[PDB]
Design a protein around this ligand. Structure first.
Ligand SMILES: [Mg+2]
Ligand SMILES: [Mg+2]
Ligand SMILES: [Mg+2]
Ligand SMILES: [Mg+2]
Ligand SMILES: [Mg+2]
Ligand SMILES: [Mg+2]
Ligand SMILES: [Mg+2]
Ligand SMILES: [Mg+2]
Ligand SMILES: [Mg+2]
Ligand SMILES: [Mg+2]
Ligand SMILES: [Mg+2]
Ligand SMILES: [Mg+2]
Ligand SMILES: [Mg+2]
Ligand SMILES: [Mg+2]
Ligand SMILES: [Mg+2]
Ligand SMILES: [Mg+2]
Ligand SMILES: [Mg+2]
Ligand SMILES: [Mg+2]
Ligand SMILES: [Mg+2]
Ligand SMILES: [Mg+2]
Ligand SMILES: [Mg+2]
Ligand SMILES: [Mg+2]
Ligand SMILES: [Mg+2]
Ligand SMILES: [Mg+2]
Ligand SMILES: [Mg+2]
Ligand SMILES: [Mg+2]
Ligand SMILES: [Mg+2]
Ligand SMILES: [Mg+2]
Ligand SMILES: [Mg+2]
Ligand SMILES: [Mg+2]
Ligand SMILES: [Mg+2]
Ligand SMILES: [Mg+2]
Ligand SMILES: [Mg+2]
Ligand SMILES: [Mg+2]
Ligand SMILES: [Mg+2]
Ligand SMILES: [Mg+2]
Ligand SMILES: [Mg+2]
Ligand SMILES: [Mg+2]
Ligand SMILES: [Mg+2]
Ligand SMILES: [Mg+2]
Ligand SMILES: [Mg+2]
Ligand SMILES: [Mg+2]
Ligand SMILES: [Mg+2]
Ligand SMILES: [Mg+2]
Lengths: 96, 61, 50, 102
RNA sequence: GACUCGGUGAAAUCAUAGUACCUGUGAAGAUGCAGGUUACCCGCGACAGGACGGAAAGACCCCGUGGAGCUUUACUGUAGCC
RNA sequence: GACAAUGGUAGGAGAGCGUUCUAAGGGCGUUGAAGCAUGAUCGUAAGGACAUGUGGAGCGCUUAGAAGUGAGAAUGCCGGUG
RNA sequence: GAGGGUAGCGGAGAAAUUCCAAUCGAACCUGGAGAUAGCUGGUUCUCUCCGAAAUAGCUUUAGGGCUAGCCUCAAGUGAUGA
RNA sequence: GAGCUGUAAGUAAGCUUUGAUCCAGAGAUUUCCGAAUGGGGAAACCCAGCAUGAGUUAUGUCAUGUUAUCGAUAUGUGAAUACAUAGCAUAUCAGAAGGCACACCCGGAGAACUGAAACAUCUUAGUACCCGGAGGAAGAGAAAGAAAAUUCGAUUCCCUUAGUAGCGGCGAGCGAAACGGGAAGAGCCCAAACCAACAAGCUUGCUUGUUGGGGUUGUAGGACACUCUAUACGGAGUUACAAAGGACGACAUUAGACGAAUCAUCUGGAAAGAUGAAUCAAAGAAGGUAAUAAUCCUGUAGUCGAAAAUGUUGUCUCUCUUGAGUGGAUCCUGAGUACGACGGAGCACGUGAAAUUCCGUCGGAAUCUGGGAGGACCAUCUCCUAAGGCUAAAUACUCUCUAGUGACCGAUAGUGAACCAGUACCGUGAGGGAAAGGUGAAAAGCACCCCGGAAGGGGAGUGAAAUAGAACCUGAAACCGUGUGCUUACAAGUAGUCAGAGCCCGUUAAUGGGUGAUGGCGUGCCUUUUGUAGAAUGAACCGGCGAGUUACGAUUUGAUGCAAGGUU
């Protein structure tokens, strides 16, 4: 309340909407993938069990922050272009 | 204590609403009509709603 | 180690003596006591748990 | 009460501690007893009452029953009392000698 | 009636009070502050100038986005009537 | 050892006093507890002892915990008494 | 005079806002209920350090409030202050 | 198992071991009013009828039973009006009524102050109040569900989702649900098709109605046809699924019984305290006892116990009862319903793009190749199968009883009420509504003397104490008195403070205490104010009581644990 001056949150306008079908992904970066032994088959179940991912949300997306230092076969619902490139370049493989 | 002898159709309560949405209590009364029908095998003048009378489903005698 | 009826009943009326099990250990009882007398089985159970 | 009219009792607490006497009345609702020669009170008696002669009358006042103890029939020592059942009748037993009291 | 004596015996009020006047000072009209002036201690009958005396959280005045009763071609409604 | 600061209303910050209850430890008490009363006692303050009288059965102390925790004012409420 | 009737969004009035159980512009009791009170009053131990404001802007706002300004506590920067 | 005739003392008369009083189960009696019911009535009263009986020569009088209204079921009678229908009369009914636990549940009807810094939509709130209906719980409930996968499988309730999605003068504010995690779990019966019997219309065609059978659904089910299976073998049951019992047993409740172990001295009125030496402990819970007791009493741990009534249960008995599959020709599967329009309401959702659901009014389907839903609507797909009913548990609450608990009160507190309190008192009434606890261990409650009419007192005595003597533990302050050390009748006082002789004392023994001739200085406190000695406000005085709390969220700081994890 501002003593009768039109309050801020009435002088400013509303914006936007919320998407009913909004999707959000549990994200995993390459630096986090670095904990699995080279040759590992990283899957959503393995990520959850290992505790890298707690809440899977709409699925696992791999992102490219940090450096991958291991060869892995990564199964996830989505990949950043950079994440897929790093996984392949380290000799590993990725699949959606 | 006024209702349709056949169906129990009775008055209800609700609001009269103005254009400014002011509210005042009002009633919706049944469209009751005093008719002579057969009650326990004998003629009797009872209150019957028009809807209960519709399509000759009640015998007036 | 577990509920020992005869030990409980023999110690119950002695002022200053409290009886518990390995699972029943709690900070107030331990701290109030001056000495702990624990059977070997109970000690092993406590060691496992903690 | 464990003490009974006619019992011979020893006073174990009070001014008369150590005295022995006969229980000549009990007050169950007060847990009290009257013992001969014990707890003597000097009451001011008006001669003007229904008794012509008056003055200072000396009589026993009741004492709390937990202040008297039964005397063992054999050893004559103060004793607590237990109960036995002999042919379906309760018998008071001195806990020191085991003998029946009355 | 008041007054004196015997009997009986309230009340409003009240921060503590050993409670003068004048001219001044000061929240601008002082028993209580300054400077003077006057005044031995304690009653009783009386008078009402002051204690901005008591009594009632001013009723006049204004204020509160207070209340209530009242009016109407204020607004919005509504019983009822057509 | 030196030398610097220390008026203060609203208000912010800090350290403490005292009250009742609880826990644990350690004590006191009919050879007289608490309460009350008096005194020329001690601490920088809130406050803490001691002695004596009264009183007649309960109460300190230490550390921690918890609060119906401190009154001088509300034309405050109740009582007592002017 | 006696026995009765009319009841509060209501009665009654040869009409005064007049009466309805000693105050009627809407009786009395209980409840919603601690209505609401931007108003007045009140708000209880101690010491130590710092210490304002009575302005601007906007406000159905003007003895209210919000943000800024001025106080305080803490952390940070580091000479940027006088 | 020895005393007893309540509070409640006294006196009197009595009772009780031939078992009182007292405690528990069962039974008897149980005036009058009150729903109050024979009628009336200003409740606790008055006045009757009828039958039977008592009494009187008879009347008068009395006793017992019975006589309200409505409802239901029978019987008789029966108007206008013929038939019989109102009506009327009689009989039966453990039929209803009224009360309340200021609670919880369901429903009818339904505010306002208030918030929105005004106010109308909105909020307060479907709350308060009123009314109806319950039940021990109620409500809900076996998908015309939730959804969108590897789908789930009645209802209710808790956690979470989440102050999210949304609603909203898009203001104040209002505010889900599904999923996931849990408590608890249980499923059933009709309507219809069709069949058999009975009755009316008498096609005496076969239509209608009643009874019984049959049947119960989405994986569509059933009828119907056929094939197996059984006449209670099995299965089920009075908590739904049909509804009454009986026998025996167990356990529990309603009285009770046993139940270990301490002596001495000191102090003291009294020992449980202190001291010394012992003892029990499945008992060191607690209360009492002349002060503070494991061992004195009542008890506690432990063990035992029921003539009788009640409750919960088990087994027998009893009762009831067929259970599956195949076929797709025909038949059935809830109508003035679903649904629509208009007006309202309810859904977190304020009419909105408004699904989903109810009410009034009017209109008004389809029939398994059907119908409903997936938030307007259509298509497709998917999930369901309305318009009939029942159903335990998990959930809510506490007038009450039993056993317990509390860093809850301790007589201005705690209930309004510790006490003869919803009393006294106030009011026509609804209604409002107090104050008031404590002798002592024991009543031993002051024999006797003295002054006084008494009250009251002084002795004496009881008692540890009367200086505990009756609202009698302690006994503060205001206030009122008596005595007195210092002081005061030439003085102008917010009463003190600083200086100071004189006089009187002598302490927590301190460079003391009381008083104060005289000098300097000095206009209370609080509140509120630019500023108050203020002649602005408040307080007569003293005492007690009397105001930032708690819950749940948010944020920040300190603390601590763990850390790319942390936490339930
Ligand atoms: Mg005269
Ligand atoms: Mg006189
Ligand atoms: Mg003043
Ligand atoms: Mg001037
Ligand atoms: Mg002067
Ligand atoms: Mg005046
Ligand atoms: Mg005024
Ligand atoms: Mg300072
Ligand atoms: Mg200075
Ligand atoms: Mg502070
Ligand atoms: Mg307080
Ligand atoms: Mg008149
Ligand atoms: Mg006028
Ligand atoms: Mg009048
Ligand atoms: Mg309210
Ligand atoms: Mg108020
Ligand atoms: Mg300063
Ligand atoms: Mg404006
Ligand atoms: Mg009658
Ligand atoms: Mg408003
Ligand atoms: Mg307002
Ligand atoms: Mg139900
Ligand atoms: Mg607008
Ligand atoms: Mg399906
Ligand atoms: Mg049944
Ligand atoms: Mg015993
Ligand atoms: Mg014993
Ligand atoms: Mg002894
Ligand atoms: Mg509509
Ligand atoms: Mg739809
Ligand atoms: Mg629809
Ligand atoms: Mg859709
Ligand atoms: Mg249930
Ligand atoms: Mg007291
Ligand atoms: Mg009280
Ligand atoms: Mg009271
Ligand atoms: Mg006294
Ligand atoms: Mg002189
Ligand atoms: Mg100021
Ligand atoms: Mg002014
Ligand atoms: Mg003055
Ligand atoms: Mg004022
Ligand atoms: Mg005043
Ligand atoms: Mg006071």
């Amino acid at each position: 309340f501002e003593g009768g001056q039109l309050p801020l949150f009435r002088r400013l306008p509303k914006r936007g909407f919320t998407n009913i079908n909004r999707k959000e992904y549990a994200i995993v970066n390459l630096d986090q993938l670095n904990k699995f032994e080279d040759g590992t088959e990283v899957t959503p179940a393995l990520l959850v069990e290992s505790g890298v991912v707690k809440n899977e949300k709409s699925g696992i997306k791999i992102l490219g922050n940090g450096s991958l230092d291991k060869k892995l076969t990564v199964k996830a619902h989505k990949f950043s272009a950079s994440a897929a490139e790093a996984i392949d370049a380290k000799g590993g493989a990725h699949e959606v | 204590g006024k209702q349709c002898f056949v169906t129990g159709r009775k008055a209800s309560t609700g609001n009269r609403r103005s254009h400014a949405l002011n509210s005042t209590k009002r009633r919706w009364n049944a469209n009751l009509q005093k008719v002579r029908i057969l009650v326990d095998g004998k003629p009797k003048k009872v209150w019957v709603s028009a809807r209960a009378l519709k399509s000759g489903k009640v015998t007036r005698v | 180690e577990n509920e020992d009826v005869n030990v409980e009943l023999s110690a119950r009326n002695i002022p200053g003596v409290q009886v518990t099990t390995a699972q029943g250990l709690n900070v107030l009882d331990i701290t109030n006591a001056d000495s702990l007398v624990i059977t070997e089985a109970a000690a092993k159970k406590v060691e496992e748990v903690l | 009460m464990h003490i009974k009219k006619g019992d011979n009792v020893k006073v174990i607490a009070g001014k008369d501690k150590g005295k022995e006497g006969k229980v000549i009345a009990t007050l169950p609702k007060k847990d009290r007893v009257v013992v001969e020669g014990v707890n003597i009170m000097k009451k001011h008696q008006k001669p003007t009452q229904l008794n012509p002669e008056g003055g200072i009358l000396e009589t026993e006042a009741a004492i709390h029953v937990s202040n008297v103890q039964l005397l063992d029939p054999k050893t004559n020592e103060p004793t607590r009392v237990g109960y036995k059942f002999v042919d379906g009748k309760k018998v008071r037993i001195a806990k020191k000698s085991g003998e029946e009291i009355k």
